[PDB]
Amino acid sequence: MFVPSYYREPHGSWMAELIRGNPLAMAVINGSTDDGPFATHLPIIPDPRTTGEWPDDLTGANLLGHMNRANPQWQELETGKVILLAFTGPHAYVSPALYGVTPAAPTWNFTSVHVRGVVEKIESLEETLDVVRATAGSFEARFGDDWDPSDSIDYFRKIVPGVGAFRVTVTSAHGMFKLSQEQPAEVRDRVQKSFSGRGCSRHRETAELMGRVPQ
Amino acid sequence: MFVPSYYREPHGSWMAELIRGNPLAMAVINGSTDDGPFATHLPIIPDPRTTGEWPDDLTGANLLGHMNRANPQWQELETGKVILLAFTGPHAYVSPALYGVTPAAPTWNFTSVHVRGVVEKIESLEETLDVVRATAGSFEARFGDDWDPSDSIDYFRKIVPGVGAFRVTVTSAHGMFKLSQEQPAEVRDRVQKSFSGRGCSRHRETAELMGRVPQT
Ligand code: HEM
Ligand code: HEM
Ligand SMILES: N[C@@H](CCCNO)C(=O)O
Ligand SMILES: N[C@@H](CCCNO)C(=O)O
Fold it and tell me: Which domain holds residue B81?
């Protein structure tokens, strides 16, 4: 990932935090020169077996995901192939009218974590079922409303052969936290103040991140 | 892009709508087998010609973007290389507690447009300036607050040598509007109603889209 030094996450924990809150990654692998790369939006969790919860240095962590086995990307996934998992969080257009300085150019403040690693296809039906059950239970606790999957386990069994589950062993993780760090602190405060005052929670979320970087 | 039939864009204009609302794309090209694909988040606008010759499904449309020339992806951009531009819109986790049906499985409702096309690297200084000027002007008009760039054009000319601008000639565009179309109407309504009462704009936005998809 290409990241200007002043936009890197100040601490590794920022990356795990963004992934945890936005775990529907874009999973990308190389394709042919004619077709271009493959890309699928799919849910990622850390391996409950080993990594368990989200660490602050992601190197060597084991992640898990799943896709549709009919997805052509599944057939191109091979054990040993490299994969990119791109996670995105809050973002907002920055109008130079907020700056109070001239001259200027507009920009877009945004957040992204690019995780790269090596794929291992999961072939066991039960191991595959464990992955999706771990994804379900994890997300429901974090984002849901106390839903009990007990009465659905037979349903999970029935549809699970269509699940293409896989493991990713992380080789690198990079965060892009473009949050106006290139601007003077007074300028950053005006942008942050403008964002925190809008009824859009995405703008609010961007302002919160902006106020977290050191002065 | 792999899209189950019931999640395809309800109408081609939905792809234009999502791109225009969320124009910071992830621009992706193949890389080495050791490195994996290149990916850069960058702003995309339609070529000004395209609005006056609009193709139904975006096929043949021309799009414009730019990145840092110091970005290693710029050296891999070659005229004629295929590229993927991924745009994402509103999304929200769907808990089966909203369904009121058993059995069920959780899912994530989300929106995405994947645009594939052929790159043309722009090298001319004036054409590069035209790209960033039109991006700034478009985005400011759509998202900004009446900022006038006239006092900053000299500034644009100073820094435009670092811009790597490019054109993409679209070869296909596909939408993924995963908005509970697989559920019965009574189920979709419960999710919409719960999402619209969240007060988070991302959830309310997802609910509004959900309600605008006709029954499949
Ligand atoms: C916890 C949240 C879950 C989310 C967010 C989720 C999300 C997704 C997504 C985005 C896809 C599309 C992949 C592609 O485009 O190739 C997919 C496919 C699939 N997932 Fe999950 N999944 C979850 C849990 C589960 C569970 C518990 C099962 C139980 C077996 C399951 C079974 C499947 C199956 C069978 C497919 C392929 C066919 C279909 O989409 O119905 N998923 N899932
Ligand atoms: C709303 C308008 C704009 C947005 C959202 C935007 C966004 C971006 C982004 C995301 C990058 C980094 C690309 C990468 O990672 O490789 C970039 C690079 C760059 N852009 Fe823009 N841009 C805008 C307008 C402009 C304008 C009007 C100029 C004037 C020449 C300009 C000049 C540059 C330059 C010189 C770079 C590379 C070095 C640097 O970041 O200073 N941009 N832009
Ligand atoms: N870094 C330059 C260009 C930003 C607009 N395009 O990124 C500025 O902040 O003025
Ligand atoms: N189509 C199945 C699987 C959804 C979980 N994976 O997305 C359902 O909606 O129950």
Answer: 5-183
